Amino acid sequence: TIVVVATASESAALQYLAPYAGAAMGEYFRDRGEDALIIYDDLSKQAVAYRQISLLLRRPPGREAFPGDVFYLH
Amino acid sequence: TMAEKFRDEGRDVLLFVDNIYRYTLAGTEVSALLGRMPSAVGYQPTLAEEMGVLQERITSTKTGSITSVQAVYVPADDLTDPSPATTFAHLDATVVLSRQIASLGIYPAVDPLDSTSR
Amino acid sequence: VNPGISVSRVGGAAQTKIMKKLSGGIRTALAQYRELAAFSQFASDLDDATRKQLDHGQKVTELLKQKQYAPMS
Amino acid sequence: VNPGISVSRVGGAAQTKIMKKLSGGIRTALAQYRELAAFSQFASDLDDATRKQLDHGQKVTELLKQKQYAPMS
Amino acid sequence: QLDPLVVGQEHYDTARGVQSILQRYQELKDIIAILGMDELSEEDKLVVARARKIQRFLSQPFFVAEVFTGSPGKYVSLKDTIRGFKGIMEGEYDHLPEQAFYMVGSIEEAVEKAKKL
Amino acid sequence: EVQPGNVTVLADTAIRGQDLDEARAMEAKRKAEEHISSSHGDVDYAQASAELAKAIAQLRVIELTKKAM
Amino acid sequence: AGAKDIRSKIASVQNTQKITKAMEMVAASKMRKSQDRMAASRPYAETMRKVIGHLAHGNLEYKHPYLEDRDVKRVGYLVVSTDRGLAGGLNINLFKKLLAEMKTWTDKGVQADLAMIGSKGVSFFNSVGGNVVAQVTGMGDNPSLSELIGPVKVMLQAYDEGRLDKLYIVSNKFINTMSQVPTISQLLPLPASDDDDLKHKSWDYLYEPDPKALLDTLLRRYVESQVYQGVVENLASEQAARMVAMKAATDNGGSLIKELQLVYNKARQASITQELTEIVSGAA
């Protein structure tokens, strides 16, 4: 197994980008005709990191103060 | 950072935070002063980062260790409020003190049914 | 229509005198029914005097029901 | 694993046919077994087969319990 | 379209009776939750038992859900569904258990399922 | 009734007689041929029953709480 | 939803829980007083039953209608019930047991007649359509025998006049402070005694004035006592059943407080954020 780590101390850009890097690693095996499994160890923290980045950029929030994008995010 | 200087010397340190909820609330006040947009319940948008930047330095290291005991306050007795919800992510153990156990003349008045540790 | 929560500030001034005469007992019967409504979930614990008000207010409520597109003179 | 709320939208097509045929509909059986044991709290009344049904549902829930790091082939 | 001139009086009355007793069961649920069922009137217990049997009989197996459960799909005609709901409401099936109605087609499948428990 | 070394008086609690008992049975029969019933004296049960009946009325607590049941 | 509407309902459920706790306490005291009054009633029935057993089954056994099994064509029940609610399933358990035993009897084509203690039984049996023929209601906390006299008299008169051929009492037996059971027991013809008074061989009574009239009075009084005992045992069963039922209702309220408080917390959080977001987004 590959392990991708974005700890709680690290900048929010690293946190929300981390699952897309993990998917980019899984997708290589997928496109070479192999089998891969991937665990995203909390999407609900990815969402909070993306909410932080979005509110720092002054974008109008929606329900529960999350951006409108967030469904497209996941 | 004083506890960290004790850690580097090779010791085991205890760090007491008399109310971390007030650390969160002062971060909220400063965020409002700087003019940043309010987050889920009015808390600052950087809440879970500001909390993690503190709580991630309290760790064991292969030179020493800092253990921490933090008095916690739950707004409106709500364990779902973003501040308790963010703090409980970091806590390893939880000791509850009850007045009933003290009225029984038992000290320390630790409630053994609700006290918890992972 | 939810009576008693619903108000008309014009009242009887906008009614034929026959309607104005007959409506007051309907209002008092439904007000008593609303007050005695709570006991209805325990009807056969009640006294017969209040029971006669409770089952009268049900009969008035049943009488107000009316089918669409059938205006009454 | 809470039955009834949990689902697999792919379903039986994922399973090996032995597991498919053996495990059938049990999650829905537990959905109702949980809701009925929650509703029928006072006593095991109407004991037609509920003593079998609820002992089977207890026996199965006890059987599904498993210790971590002990994977079963 | 749920108007007597469009649908016809029997359908309209069956649908309104199903709504009325399911609403009365909803109104009972809070007192059933606090006190428990025993306190209800011997009338109230009958509408609760019929409303619960209606809630079960509304379920139906689907040809496309034939991969989430093993049950064969059922196609129920409008006549058979109003015939069954009108039968349940007026108490002619008061003797069957609730599980006889779960995931069945017409009522003649519920009477069969009752035999096998 | 008296016994070797013992005696007992199975005393009645009210006056008994052919007529008094027939009058009581006549009233017990009349109250059943009609449908007339009296009121228990448990004023405490009445108070608590009516307070609970008003308090439990129209809570709307289910559907508000998403409990299915 | 709405934060205030939910807090109002939370208060109303807390008030309900408090009422049910008070009712549990009251019932738990009434149960002790009732089950002591239950023990105050044994000596009369016990000493009278020893006398009846001596006269009826001992030496020189006298003959009486109540003693012997004449053929049965119709049956009588004395049914005890409460005047009050909130007792749980107690009366419906008893009445369904009666209707089952009465239906088994009416399979054989026999007729059945009922006499009622308590208002609940009157209401239920008239809704069912039972043939109630005598009743007493409004006994409350204070069951007198001088009020039982009436319906017991009607059923005894109907027996000796030859109409009723068997007589039952239908009542809940108090067994444990959390366990009571609905029962039907035969009053007349007199149940067989287990004991044999052959050890009373050594003596006989000086019967003043005459044994047969005295045995008639003894049997009438004994049936009365056995009915009164069945009323007081059912009353203590009522207090214990109400105690348990109010306990369960208080725990249901305590769970509903948790579920409503969770919904209230979510509502007030959503209100705070929806307001502060409107304010901040309004400031261009």
Q: Can you put this structure into words, describing what you see?
A:
The structure is cut from a larger assembly and holds 3 copies of chain A, 2 copies of chain B, 1 copy of chain F (69 residues) and 1 copy of chain G (284 residues). By secondary structure, chain A is mainly α. Chain A is built from 3 helices and no strands. Chain A has helices at residues 12-31, 43-56, 70-73. Chain B has helices spanning 2-8, 20-34, 47-55, 82-87, 99-103, and strands at residues 12-17, 60-61, 64-70, 93-94, 116-117. By secondary structure, chain B is of the alpha+beta class. The two termini of chain B are 27 Å apart. Chain F has one domain. Chain F has helices at 18-33, 43-56, 61-64; strands at residues 2-3, 6-7. A two-stranded antiparallel ribbon of chain F has the order 1-2. Chain F starts with a strand and ends in a 5-residue tail after the last helix. In chain F, 20% of the residues are buried. Chain G folds into 2 domains: 1-59 and 206-284, Helix Hairpins (Orthogonal Bundle); 60-205, Pyruvate Kinase, Chain: A, domain 1 (3-Layer(aba) Sandwich). In chain G, a hairpin with a 2-residue loop joins strand 4 and strand 5. In chain G, 39% of the residues are buried. Classes of the chains: A mainly alpha (74), B alpha+beta (118), F mainly alpha (69), G alpha/beta (284). Chains in contact: A-B, A-G, B-G, C-E, C-F, D-E, E-F, E-G, F-G. The A-B interface holds A 7-9, 11-12, 45, 48-49, 51-52, 55-56, 58, 61, 64-65 and B 36-40, 45-46, 48-49, 52-53, 55-56, 89-90. Chain E: Belongs to the ATPase alpha/beta chains family. T3SS ATPase subfamily. Chain E: It is found in: Cell membrane; Membrane. Chain E: Produces ATP from ADP in the presence of a proton gradient across the membrane. The catalytic sites are hosted primarily by the beta subunits. Chain E: Keywords: ATP synthesis, ATP-binding, Cell inner membrane, Cell membrane, CF(1), Hydrogen ion transport, Hydrolase, Ion transport, Membrane, Nucleotide-binding, Translocase, Transport.
Largest sheet geometry of chain G = 5 strands, mixed
Number of helices of chain G: 6
Topology pattern of chain G, helix = H, strand = E: HHEHEHEHEEH
Q: What fraction, in percent, of the residue positions of chain B are helical?
A: 25-40%
Q: From the coordinates shown, what is the CATH architecture of the largest domain in chain G? A: 3-Layer(aba) Sandwich
**Class from helix and strand fractions of chain G:** alpha/beta
Which structural class should the secondary elements of chain B be placed in? alpha+beta
Please indicate the percent range of residues of chain G in DSSP E strands (runs of 2 or more): 5-15%
Lateral arrangement of strands in the main beta sheet of chain B: 1-3-2
Using a beta-carbon cutoff below 8 angstroms, give the protein chain pair with the largest interface and the number of residues from each chain: F-G, 37 and 53 residues
Distance between the termini of chain B: 27 Å
Q: Oligomeric status of the shown chains?
A: part of a larger assembly
Number of helices of chain B: 5
Overall form of chain G: elongated
Shape of chain B: flat
Number of domains in the coordinates of chain G?
2
The helix/strand series of chain B, from N terminus to C terminus, equals: HEHHEEHEHE
